[PDB]
Amino acid sequence: PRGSHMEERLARNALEASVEERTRDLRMARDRLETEIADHRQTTEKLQAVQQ
Amino acid sequence: MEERLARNALEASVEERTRDLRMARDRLETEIADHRQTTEKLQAVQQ
């Protein structure tokens, strides 16, 4: 006993799960990298201030 | 001179971090762009 769009909804669930998990991974990578860039910016700004 | 060598080593370290962070940024930019085109194509095949 199957709905007329059951297979299509299951395919949608599969694709959605994968795409959203990739999205979370890329958000996390982006977060880590922004934090590193901020550390680097603080470091360079402070070293610039003391160079003269 | 010791202070000059230490200075240059720190300078070199900082320039290296700049290069690595730019490489990482460029790569993640491409990854994000590619993912976005996947999501847009996904979304349009439904509607």
Curated annotation (Swiss-Prot), chain B:
Autophosphorylated. It is found in: Cell inner membrane. Signal peptide: none annotated. Member of the two-component regulatory system DctB/DctD involved in the transport of C4-dicarboxylates. DctB functions as a membrane-associated protein kinase that phosphorylates DctD in response to environmental signals. This is C4-dicarboxylate transport sensor protein DctB. The gene is dctB.
